[model samples]
Target: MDKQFVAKVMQVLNADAIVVKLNSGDYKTIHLSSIRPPRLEGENTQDKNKKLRPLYDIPYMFEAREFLRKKLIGKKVNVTVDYIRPASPATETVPAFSERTCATVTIGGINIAEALVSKGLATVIRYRQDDDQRSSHYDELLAAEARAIKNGKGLHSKKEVPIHRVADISGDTQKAKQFLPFLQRAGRSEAVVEYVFSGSRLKLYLPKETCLITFLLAGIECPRGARNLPGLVQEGEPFSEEATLFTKELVLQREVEVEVESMDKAGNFIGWLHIDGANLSVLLVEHALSKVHFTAERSSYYKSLLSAEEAAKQKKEKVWAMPVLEEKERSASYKPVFVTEITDDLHFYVQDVETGTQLEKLMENMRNDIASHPPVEGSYAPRRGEFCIAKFVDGEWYRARVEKVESPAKIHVFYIDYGNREVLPSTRLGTLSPAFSTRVLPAQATEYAFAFIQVPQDDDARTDAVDSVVRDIQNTQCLLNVEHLSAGCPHVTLQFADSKGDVGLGLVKEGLVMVEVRKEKQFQKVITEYLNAQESA
Candidate 1:
């Protein structure tokens, strides 16, 4: 299913869930509960799986929220607040609030946020802010000191000296000269440099500078306040002059931009020098550089920043690897090389590690298996003939045989090797991968591909269902030739290389659908409607 759609469904269900890859393998699971986000408090499993980047850890939640906001609009929703058993072993329960029935209109969290607003429900919840004890301590101390003066002898303290006072800076002409070189370099940086003055302190703008020196003094220095501003500054006390030494680090801070003067082979600019601490964070070109006479080369630097951010994010996402067994490892006659068993009950099958076919598997006993017995309105296959039984227990497959029951999708032939003799479900099969395993494909390739269409199961209805499926394929916007037809399981295959091929096949699963465009005709068709179809899907 589409993550957004699944997210909507989860929201409607009023459940708390976060998608996670268990510490096993490639298997991903949607964990629903009130546990705090997983912590980095365990032994490292593998180097890569030891940490999860924000993108990988919470991909579904973010995607779902993003999708809902972009799609549904003007829909009323319901909300409720409740407590659920916490998933953490140390905790028993955790507080949770949920909103449902929401219509997504905007992108991001707005879909859920707006729904709560319209339903007259208490959607907004706020956590109390932590007390500001740092400031409070100064206030209490000042009050005590003031009251002490009422007595004969009063306690006295040294007065604080103000630093970074621009007047004082300018007062010492020598000090101002030392700062001139840095100021000139800042002006030449790729980022915009801003200067602002408040009280005696001077603030120099360090746009996109994320270094320690910038945080401590360069960006916004409070030299005229208490050295420890968290307390004294909160009480309006001026900073001390002793803080000037801190500026030494700021002076040494480097810029990130580079100066490019020309282009090289392969259409890329190569003749350039690094503008250390240059404000690549913000780039501006002057009219002079763009003049016909001057050939200024501006190399694209946004990609560099993006790469840095991605690296930082990856560092933050380190976590344990959640390994999962594949489908081929789970059952027999599995065409897909890997079928991942998400859980004993839930399974996912993936055709490729990147973009692949996925299927949700479910198991049914001879009596409980819905696939075996036909209902009055639902169609089913004969249990004895349809499926070939294969079971893996203790790292070995037991003997396979045929079943006597007249049903569909049977496991009767697959006998469990019990100590005494062959047994049935009584022994529990030691965690056989469930039939419901779904395939995993990258989000960019194919996403939300699976859809369960409910149809009547009677003989006439079964025929109708088969016909309906055919019609559905025929009515699909894309033009394609039907490759195969079966009354029991009717499906269409498209020509891989043709204008009238079924593009919808790529969109059947969840995630972004991307199409290759090698020709002008394909690009035009994509622009006209195919693009919109992908977006909506």
Candidate 2:
């Protein structure tokens, strides 16, 4: 007769088996009758000297063992024994049967086998006949497995899990050469960004294959973020945090187009991501968040990426704004000294001969200063038409000119080369010149400045036309000839010209920049003539 009794779980043997002390005070093994949790290593009876082989996926095995430990260990449970193992010596069975009974174990009101199968942590063992023939829970267990598989739960879900055994491709030329073909064959595919491993690499999920593929962003290298391994020290890089966050925000959980260029020895596909029709790798380079990684294996997109990086470097973009840290400076023991007080970004700090303790004290002082008066909006105002560097919200600094002073503490500024306008408080502004300290611009001062022709509101065609003109002159050298400073405002009444004749006139003629008659009274006649000529043509 099958015995049913209460027991205290003494040990969780594996995911599917447990050793319990029965009410009668005898300890026995209870094997879950219908489900197999992922396997751990077990001894070989025939060849005890042989090395143990993994029986299931390593991740699933660990998860299953952990789940059982959390659910059953040290808990009282009900056990119903169906069959005991025959007293014969153990043979070369894959799952070696010991002196264990096939049993139904329950905690509270729920059967353990049904629970495990439902969670996708175990598969139903369909081959057992004695219990299979008699048990009414068989259909329920099968239904649970089906639901798990259908919903893609736990082990049923496919994902590209990163494999980090191989060293980075940047350090290995031969390995990169070997991986080129695999990458090329991967070609263009639609994949969802499953995981981002820093700024450069991501795991892509291909729906057709139902598998995850790891890909390295081609032609760009971002600074290293945190490492997966414990006890490993990070050689800190500037903009590392920004780069990781930017990539995550742009592509995480989004479907993107991937063009595989090459592969690394570690089987990571080196590819370019096209998200929303824009190449994300190039965008990262262009934005100055990443640098062009020059590799021996050249791709068709290399030239454009190189050009984008050069433009960012010339503009003093985030990574290029500061000098690269030397090996000694980046070492774990190096202490950073503050040349100036702390700003929004820490890039201004330098490593000197000071001890780490001194550095800590200086940092405390800096923090105290920040506490007293915040840098973002305290008392530092900039003059109209004054060229200065201001920090973006993301901590990137750009060259900007004060377009208009709204008040003693607030001003509107235009990014000189990037062509964007923003209104900022006085404290958020800083000077590019060393002589000019942080201070408010005089409210009554008048200066004549040549502002870019403003685009008309609610006109997309004209806006795009103006953008094209801006892009053309963005990095070009120009001469500004100031005629007379405006009386009421610090507007430089000036003419802008380059190798091309009369940029202001050209912009007006193209209907890209609107020449305000009131603001440009000195050049109003010239601007009107240009507009008339354009209308006639």
Candidate 3:
């Protein structure tokens, strides 16, 4: 089939092979016709005897890969197939039609695919195309350049006044000071992605006006890969490389359109990028490379980005699959707190009982503050140890520390006052105000199990245990005595405010739980006490 088409070079797999994304959004891998790229993969005569380190082993391999990577990493190129190398079929581990389409690629007239093979960087397969190939105008472009060198003419001439006269105005605050007005008024302008600083960040170059904007992707956000701050690399988070790579291949060095929403204090334009007439923000989320992070509800794309993220979580995408952190050790200490909230299994949130008034004030101030100056969804990027404000299922706000960030959407937060852990959407998490971040209040919830007994593992027994325990302790004021710290958690003898006894004795007297004889000099008295409660029954 002699069809010609154009696609952006997605990635150069090797000197001879590149993957391209079609205008139809399908991806295809093409190899330059009959040429051999430098190989680091392996050699012909190996019985696994010799190992090959391709970069230096194959002369010009790095140069070969770099040549194509630099020329067309995300640049669109014209491709036409001359031959399809037929090969084996595919299973789950492979793709269908293993044979690559051997193609002749050109830039209008120049057989640019031949450019590398034309040089010593790649070797031809014995010999390699034709009116479609050799007719490539690289020869003409070369001669034009050659003639210029010969005549010392035009660009080669000393008479040249450099046409590229634009100042590198990016990162200059005053340039953006005057620059932002022009950007804000210009509705949906054509621009080029000069660089992809991050999945949610790009450097856009407006050609007509000759200015650069450090553009932050609007309505979405994700982790960025490590960056070389100056010379050394700094830390980044999970899926960082994947996000960066996908973003680079999709937009780096490619032309795009940009919309300016607002400017940050650092002179960066917080806005959106468009490709194929849709915001790249949604597209990135659709690919699971980014999540909907918006102050962008201010724009038309909010619902679009939100829906894409909804799908990412539903599919258990990469940004959502990070491993969770196990709960950490808490000191064994008794604190007087009221169970303001409780879960079905007895996990609860409690504030220091008298401190309920303080919790109410903080809650009111925070709710009122967010009502007027609401936190943007997708703006909170949770860190494992970071403190953030979490909105409970009931819309109450609590100060919580992030234990883990996973599922992009489900963030694990431990309420500081109540010590109950819950997972919430990043949309429901907000940057902890330094005012709210204060720790004049220590975490109030003391995690504990009955000191001498645990409910049977059977669901029926546990349900009764749950029913009885909740009736007695759920949201009821009680005294909790820390008896032992077990397995990084606490065990307690919980007593009523007006009575002194093991609550487990009652659960045992009711035949709801079995005792685990915990051996300790301090635990024996309690063990015998509970044993009799069971024996007497």
Candidate 4:
């Protein structure tokens, strides 16, 4: 008896074998019966010797994968097992695997295997006279193939084979940075997820950009699976595998729209990913596969994620099953940190007033080592986006990322910890010492925003907003109340340590920044006082 049931797609191992998860959470390898996808393997030939991408080397191989990848990666399909192909014993030369269940996978009443045949991405396979390992709907695949062959579609077409020449820039920071600004500016750009590294991380292929990029899910912390690194194996957090499976089954190979906001030094893009008109981060929280990270607190969907998390907790869903220990480090009390600098965007960089000396020691030690082991001239070849030690205009070494190797003589570098940019001679650049890398030293500057005020886009008014902020923070440590969290930044309401004047209200009173139009019920009382003060301005 053939068992038919609805199942979610886990991963498409190749064109024919699709991994599906049953309702009981068990997975099955389904080989679409009586059909064969383009062969990915062949002996040494001119193309093989040249090491051309095997994906494009074999005729229609890439197309075959794409046809199925796009149609089935994360979506559910009704599967009916047509036959159980018995396993073959291993020979001395060949490896062996278990038995396979050949099946007819359908969605919306269309047979997936037949569709592949119709597109000529795969051809129907003929079995021996008495073969039992054929599809229940084998004749349907034959009819579809006949139409494909008659119409000269796909592989049968005399036209040129379609090819993809997407640039993989996963670890190339320089290229990522060059591509970063334009990508962020390309708001809500459409992309296809090519790989799922974890629940929170993905590799996306942008058709318009013709490039592949590492993408980070903006505002939630998804569980991670164990990873075997170079020297040591990294252990996974609890429910990491479940979280990854949850994400993979929903978004892997699915079409998505992204809003990129920032790029990390590792060249990964951070942004919100939306699929089928829903935020992926919100969906993860709703499913209890992920919890909202501090970064989500100030995002557009923060309230939505908060509510989802609350429900998950009440239901004690997966990650929320155990009593969660309060994060003592994330206390509600006002903390002491002083503003070091304010940017044109009205975001200010801070250093803890009480514990600010930590950065001083890191700087001193880094400089001391560089002095002792003088950066050998012409020692490092700088690539755009690669991290390196750079000599500032004042002749001090600092951690910097190469923006551009403008010429053989000069290069543009942005100091990672300084929130500033500088162009220095090639002679001034050095390979970042292994001991002084980001692994040991992290960026010192922390950017934060005042919670209530929304500075208008007017150029002069925006300038005033920043000027107003600088005038508010003094040498004394400000009483910083972290009201909301944005990825690497925080939105806070601050009071000057010496004057005790509220920073956001002071700026509102100056009429430089408008009290935000968005309603925040939790801040109603605070908002009332600001609106009253704003009336005068």
Candidate 5:
């Protein structure tokens, strides 16, 4: 007999079955009559049951079961009982067979079996009795399953796709060994390239499931993308933008095969991608867009990568042909100059030492100047044959003699203590005494120039004396009488007199400033007396 009843579904037993409470306060298990969900567990040992596992695992399994629970649990449903097995009680020690019923469950006018089958959560199945002439829903359930499979929906999506073996493709021994373990885990599958993140990274869509996977190219590194600069083109290491474009042209929207090698620490898949029977990693290296980067754990294709890199180098590849930015050269006539600004890769602004003239020049031009002029021995200028303190590369002031003047701005100096010579920019050198007027004045000043008494390098005590003299003259006006301008530097000499007395004589008396009396006759009388007094003392 067939009976129809309305009941509240209390729980979903599996994807295709449910338990409902009837109006008589009795619970009944209702199994869908025409379709079967994937098996959850094997039936109890009874007459040699066929061993079957759940069709859905992990991602799909949870989805299918949860979907049924949300749809039917605690909801009122119309159930039509089609058949029920008769119950038999045990007499002595033999157990009785449990009663079960096959029914059609409908909630909100939707057949549960048709709903499950059409969504690819369940497959159509007909028992011996359900296939009889009286049963008419068999064809409907079969049609639902067919539609799901044809559209690649749910469990039917990529589940039956065959895994490709690594050995069948590029037969790299080490890659095969490394890939075999992962293949045993996740298995190999066909995927379509969705997007290329960079030259060495990409996003792939696995057909087996509705999910995306990221694959990083193994054993190769590409230049980083260019950085956008305002009002100018993107700038970066050479060939960076080109590498990304090349990767996009090769893989986007194309069908590819991927072999899972291992999981990265962040849970990303690290593997090799094959497209059109070509390994993407090898292709990148061969095209010179990337270079081989070997880790301590060598890959099976390391030799192949090395071979490609060697060929690229031999052909003067992109990175190999790039120009070198700097080279060192030795020059005796080169003077040190302050690099004030760098405009670009090959241009800079520098200030001359003697003239304080700032000029922009090409780096190549500066290099050429050093190459053309040679160093002169025993030649010095401006402070000719005199000693002064200069800052060296070591960040300390050292006593050095002005060895040669290459230009109005360039000066070569010889370190007295270290016995080494180098051409330095004039900005790097400082005066030892305020008594030397040229130390305070700008280079090549013609209106009025003070010729400082050139000091000798006897004691390293002149810097402090000069600092005191500068402090005494701070914000004070003094009489300035212009002597004759020097021939070489075109600077006028001025004798400074303040309320205290002749400042030049005061420097001589303090033994901080020295003078060549014959060469500087204008200040000879004052300097001679001061020298005589120091000798007498």
Candidate 6:
């Protein structure tokens, strides 16, 4: 908190130190003198007067202090400490704290990202817990470097200049001194200066002309020597816009040369200015932009690859017909239909019923269903043993577990299947299931149920549109009917039975749908009625 303490610490440790304000409006310094140890609840203490743990443990505290010294020597810094309290209602004791510093220190323009990665700054917390430390660390480093470059800030370092030249400008020594102030100002502001002294001659190099002008105006005269100065002014028109733009655009990794034509008292200007060096500014920009672009492309590619892998990994089970169609056989008199199981987990598979070479097609079909059977805001019910199918944004299908039919248009929902077998809250579906319907699911049921409509196509219509537009329309119609039928069919079985009767209306099932419905409503009154009337009494 005291400036003397900070300054002394810097002097002793040879580091740059600064105090900075945090977003939380708290002032903190990177150099935290103390830190409380992590506390455990209900631990016995000798007495109320017992000393609390130090804010930082000895090892980490020392390491941080040393690291600060090594990296920020002689640089200004702003430090902030974030203190956290342990959970204890009775005692108002602070537990632990962390420190961060934003200081002036020079880092390699090319290696900043690598350093951040080394420090593990770029990874998500969850990933760190999951053993992805290296990946996250590297990413963090790159991100930090990118941000620094984007802000046009870099660390300070000793300038390297191995050559020097001096130009004679008659006896106008005062006028010549103007250039030294400019050079010095440039060094302190936009540029830098480095010089080597050899005998009476001093070779000075100006990283920026503005800095040279600043120093020159300040009356800092350079030593008079043939090799100590280079003519800063050129006797010609200024560079063209095109040439200036090109010069400014040069990157650090590349070299550039500027040639100037010099005129003498004889009025002969026949030479060009030769300017060349590694353009750090341009290199920083190029590296930062390229890094961001590379990371974005990699992320996109990985996401696509993950999806492709999942699709190829999906399990497919064949449906076998039992000897009796009810036992897996259908009568010619009645339209053939298959009933499948609909559990809290098993309601509908979009790709299973729809014809598609890709998941996008199935998703499109599902979106169409949302448009057709748009659920009235508060009105959505499931028939006794039926399920409801809903499409989500990503072309995914949700099978909601139905609890009961509250009304013809309202369903008492329960749970719905996420991509995995786990049944999550219907509310998690986002807009896929309206927010109001999320709470409507019955809490008593383990999970929600879902339904899919099956479209029937004649032999002629099937072959040509095996994957055509007409088949898709027909299938969507079937899916819609199944959705409506399950809305409030008297019994879960009747819902499927009725859906079967309307198979002519395009409801096609591979048997699992009916099976699941029958099993789900096995104990319902509607199924009992059919059993009682058909039994050989």
Number of the top candidate by TM-score? 4
Q: Estimate, for each residue in 1-537, the C-alpha lDDT of model 3 and write its tens digit.
A: 335798888767656778888878778887776555654343353632464434334556655665676677767788877666676322211456577577777665656555665444554443233333422234443444455456654224465332333345566556777877777789788886766776777777686886667887777657755533211223666687788777787777566888787765446777778886767878878878776653556677778878888898898868877112223342234545565554555344444577668767777886787777777888656655556788888877777877766656878888876767898888898876655545444444545566678647787878788788777777877666666655534566666676755567788888888777765555546678888888877
Tens digit of lDDT per residue, candidate 6, span 219-257? 011111121111111121222222222322231112123
Error of 2 at 472 (Å): 62
Candidate 1 residues 41-112, lDDT tens each?
353536547454332233133233333322331222222222222233422134333222112222344333
Q: lDDT of model 1 at residue 217?
A: 13
| lDDT value, residue 527 of candidate 2 | 49
Model 6 is weakest, by summed lDDT over 10 consecutive residues, at 213-222
Listed in order, each prediction's TM-score against the native is: 0.15, 0.29, 0.41, 0.56, 0.28, 0.17
CA deviation > 4 Å runs, candidate 2: 1-183, 226-232, 322-537
Better of 4 and 6 by TM-score: 4
TM-score (C-alpha, index-matched) for candidate 6 = 0.17
Q: What's the best-to-worst order under lDDT?
A: 4, 3, 2, 5, 6, 1
Candidate 4 clashes between residue pairs 3 or more apart in a chain or in different chains: 174-384, 174-385
Instruction: Name the top lDDT candidate.
Output: 4
Worst 10 residues of 5 by lDDT: 162-171
Model 3 residue 224 CA deviation in Å: 4.1
| Per-candidate local distance difference test | 0.26, 0.57, 0.66, 0.76, 0.54, 0.28
lDDT of 2 by residue, 1-537 (tens): 338888877656657787777667677877877666654336333542463322223436545655776677667998787656554132434456545567788898988888878777788867645533323467788898998898876556676532212123332436556646754676777876756877777877664544556777876667665432221222446788888767876776566888776564345666789988888888888889987755512767788788888899999858998112223221112122212211121111112223335434533553454445444444354544455656667765554667666664567886542345678776677545322212221111112233334435656755565465445443343343333333322222222333435545665666655654433344455446655745754
Query: Of 2 and 6, which scores higher on lDDT?
Result: 2
Candidate 3 ranges beyond 4 A from true positions: 1-109, 113-142, 145-154, 169-178, 224-238, 320-537
- What lDDT score is found at residue 436 in candidate 4? 68
Off by over 4 Å in 1: 1-111, 120-122, 130-537
When sorted by TM-score, best at the front, the candidate numbers are 4, 3, 2, 5, 6, 1
Answer with 2 or 3, whichever has the higher TM-score: 3
Error of 5 at 391 (Å): 34
